Design a binder for this molecule. Structure first.
Ligand SMILES: [Ca+2]
Ligand SMILES: [Ca+2]
Lengths: 56, 56
């Protein structure tokens, strides 16, 4: 089902940006713990995005 | 199957990291970061169900 493939690929991609929008608001508030996790999420989502692009 | 494990396990982990950020945001009272964290949790859960369906 490409429907599932599209969700996986489009969401993983969109989460990367969302993660960065958080990382930016975090650094403003100097919220360093939130900042670190947001980076991590950005990095996990990118991995999902790469894995998907390839597999599908 | 390497991509599958990655797509599956990371979409699930992100879902957890999204809620961890939601709590810290709530404590610090960061409403914006809090709404986005929710969203990310929700989008990660979608990648998770879709992969679960696609790979299962
Ligand atoms: Ca990184
Ligand atoms: Ca890249």
């Amino acid at each position: 089902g490409t429907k599932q493939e599209k969700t996986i690929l489009n969401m993983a991609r969109f989460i990367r940006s969302q993660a960065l929008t958080i990382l930016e608001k975090a650094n403003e508030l100097d919220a360093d713990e939130i900042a670190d996790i947001a980076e991590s999420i950005h990095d996990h989502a990118d991995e999902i995005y790469r894995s998907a692009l390839a597999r599908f």
